[PDB]
Subunit: 162 residues, 6 copies
Amino acid sequence: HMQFDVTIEIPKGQRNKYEVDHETGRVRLDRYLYTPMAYPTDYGFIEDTLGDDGDPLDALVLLPQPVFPGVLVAARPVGMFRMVDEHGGDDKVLCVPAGDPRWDHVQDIGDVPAFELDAIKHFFVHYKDLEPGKFVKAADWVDRAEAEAEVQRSVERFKAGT
Amino acid sequence: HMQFDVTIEIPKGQRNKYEVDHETGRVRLDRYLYTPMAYPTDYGFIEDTLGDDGDPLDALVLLPQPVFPGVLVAARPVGMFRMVDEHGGDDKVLCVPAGDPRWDHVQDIGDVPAFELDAIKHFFVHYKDLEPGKFVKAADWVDRAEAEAEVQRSVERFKAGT
Amino acid sequence: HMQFDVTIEIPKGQRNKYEVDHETGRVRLDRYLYTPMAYPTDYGFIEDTLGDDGDPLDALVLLPQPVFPGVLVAARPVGMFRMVDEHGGDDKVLCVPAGDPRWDHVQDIGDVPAFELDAIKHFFVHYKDLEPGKFVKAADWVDRAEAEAEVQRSVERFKAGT
Amino acid sequence: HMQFDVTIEIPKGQRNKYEVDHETGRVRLDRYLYTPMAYPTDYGFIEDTLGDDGDPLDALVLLPQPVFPGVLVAARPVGMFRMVDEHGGDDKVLCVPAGDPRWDHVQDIGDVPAFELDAIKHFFVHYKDLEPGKFVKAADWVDRAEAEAEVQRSVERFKAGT
Amino acid sequence: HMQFDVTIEIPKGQRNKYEVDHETGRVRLDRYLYTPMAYPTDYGFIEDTLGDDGDPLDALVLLPQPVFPGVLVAARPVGMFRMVDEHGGDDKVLCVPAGDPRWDHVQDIGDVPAFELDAIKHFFVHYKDLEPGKFVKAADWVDRAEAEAEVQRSVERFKAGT
Amino acid sequence: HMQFDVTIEIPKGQRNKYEVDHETGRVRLDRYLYTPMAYPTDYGFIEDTLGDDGDPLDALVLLPQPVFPGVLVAARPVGMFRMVDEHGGDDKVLCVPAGDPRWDHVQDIGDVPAFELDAIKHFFVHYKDLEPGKFVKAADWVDRAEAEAEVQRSVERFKAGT
Ligand SMILES: [K+]
Ligand SMILES: [K+]
Ligand SMILES: [K+]
Ligand SMILES: [K+]
Ligand SMILES: [K+]
Ligand SMILES: [K+]
Ligand SMILES: [K+]
Ligand SMILES: [K+]
Ligand SMILES: [K+]
Ligand SMILES: [K+]
Ligand SMILES: [K+]
Ligand SMILES: [K+]
């Protein structure tokens, strides 16, 4: 039942860390990563959400082929990666394409292979290893119901801000 | 004499079916194709046109190297692929870059090799084979004069809507 | 238990049809396909096998990332695509990487999603549509036990020829 | 101290000459180059600048990995390529990523290897060789202080126009 | 009637100059080019030929999609680029795929557009501009009959050497 | 003065771990890495060397553009990464292209930026994090003189084995 639009900022396999400027919609290169790592899934954020830090809620989308920075994908949540960085919580909703029967076997976090979840976790735990003052901690996976609650509160924050 | 701007949605060689949202201009992933096929030419639509279905008129552009989703190319028509899908007519104007003398040998539909036209037709006839309820029929090639008439009526519809 | 080496001739996503010359080991471009299609999986043949036609037994390998023409991959069979072309039988063994626990969930043909099997079938049924005199018919999927029997007989033929 | 945003129009290695339309922000294919050449660095323009010809000031950005057309990169100048074409001056500011310590060794034009500067010059001197009526002349490298003066005047022109 | 096998050393679009070692068959990186140029066509040599300098006769092959270094392509000649470098003659036979009806319109040098021939010439005239002591001169196009004579003499030299 | 040939097995940016079989020369896929990491430089081994474990001595080559698996590059050493894995020593010689003046500024280990050396180290320290029983320890950089001594002993071992 829940679905939303994700804007992918960074396709799977990138060492260039792109970000959308949420005031203008422009794509920016934030930085080239300092570690020999690459985003493990397409990565971006959920449109029309607002986290407590004032940015949209982050999203990871499982896909058969990556998209390009800036592309929208209708998606549904199947779990969430809870984590903190140097600025506090920075959780990521894990998603699959909405309306696509090739993904109907993936409904909740236990439907994603551990090898894939462990590689995602490894990326976020280590990608900033060589950036002074930056880190990732308190990182773990939670289920779809918890992810949906996090999306819902972030939708509420967005609507309160309009 | 006739030329127009085409926005390419899908570069040649893609199995990701991108589409521009005509209200916002954003690029969206519609779907990953269900068949092991790839767009045979760069594919998109003609800016400032409106077909009867309320979307712009589709376009195919022959190029020496593909572009990226969302890129504009000034183009001129050399023929049209007439076809119907599950929603009725969904014709495509075949184009070459405007103002480029490397394409001056291509003025009308007979100037495009049959192998290329037959591969284009094959794509549209088969790409939805594995999507239930979707199909393509009544598919054939027509000449530049017919293509230009179709563009002109779609320009008229666009202007009437403003 | 059964495993073998596959030489991949054609990575997933190719419209260039490469083939290894079995006398010299050289990679050759056989042809650019005439249809707007691309190999649905990495494709090649099983080393040290001989089919009745005097060529090695063909193989399809499911992978998380494609390889390059000429690369060896240790693989194990999970089923087979039976088909005939203009020259008679030309079956393909479907395989996954051997010794890799990320594939342990795939043991037999029912463990591969229908969407993937149907796309593979579609490729072989249609890729020669635009080549005169060439075709593919009598095409269907069989299980691992049948695939292993076909591999074994082809290993026997190879050894008899030495 | 000086930094600015560059919009990259053309990634390193491209023979497709993309340009941003400065009225709309859309990316357009200007042309496929007529020579067998490719942009030697990521290439674009400095946001919120206006040259005498009414377009923003051009920029070259040294990067470890190219970006995509339309991407913003915060950059700082280290020199400038002075040149004229068929329409007069068309200088390019040479830049490195701002705020990135991997580039702190590059502060002025003498910090860029001659092989790289000579390849950049070669590109602009020759890329239009096969376009009638188009050329590049009076081409040479100047230092950061001269580049910064050119940026500053172009920022002043931009602000006067608002 | 004449055809031969070409080994492609360098795909279209490369700035890495690969070469096959003719004693071992191994692919080597000769050098990264010093100019911001890229091979305009797939480039290599004709198997079982020997030029006067003791290397096989060079070949350019027109293709719809490039191959990989080391790949064989059955080809037929349609003309030749005569040129000299710092070591004397170093002519290139221009070819199209043999046995492929998509190329039947290309029989001789006048069937290749001037824009393509001029870009090929430009590449060889300029690619060594920034290499001291290296150059290309006396460069021009000749017809298929002249190309075939050059191939034939080089086949004769090869056979005399066995 | 010292130079040698390196066969690159794995281009920069790969998550596919290729290896050459030293008995046959064939390229094999060893495995897809289990971590979201990619080789930080082109990686392979020095031809005509033998380490104590019976395999050639490993090499890392700094390049402006990656090569393809199996390609030879004439190289010279500028330092070495000393490390141990689950099987003992598995050091890597760090190299630049031989005979190429664009690399003449890199003569010893202090001429390579720390950011690059630290990223290389990070790769080897972490790439097997998610493989049970596999690890990398005792990892550090040493100078050219030490690297050359290691190459020389491995050349001696190779020659003793013939
Ligand atoms: K966030
Ligand atoms: K850190
Ligand atoms: K339409
Ligand atoms: K259908
Ligand atoms: K076969
Ligand atoms: K057919
Ligand atoms: K300008
Ligand atoms: K010119
Ligand atoms: K030659
Ligand atoms: K020169
Ligand atoms: K080793
Ligand atoms: K481990």
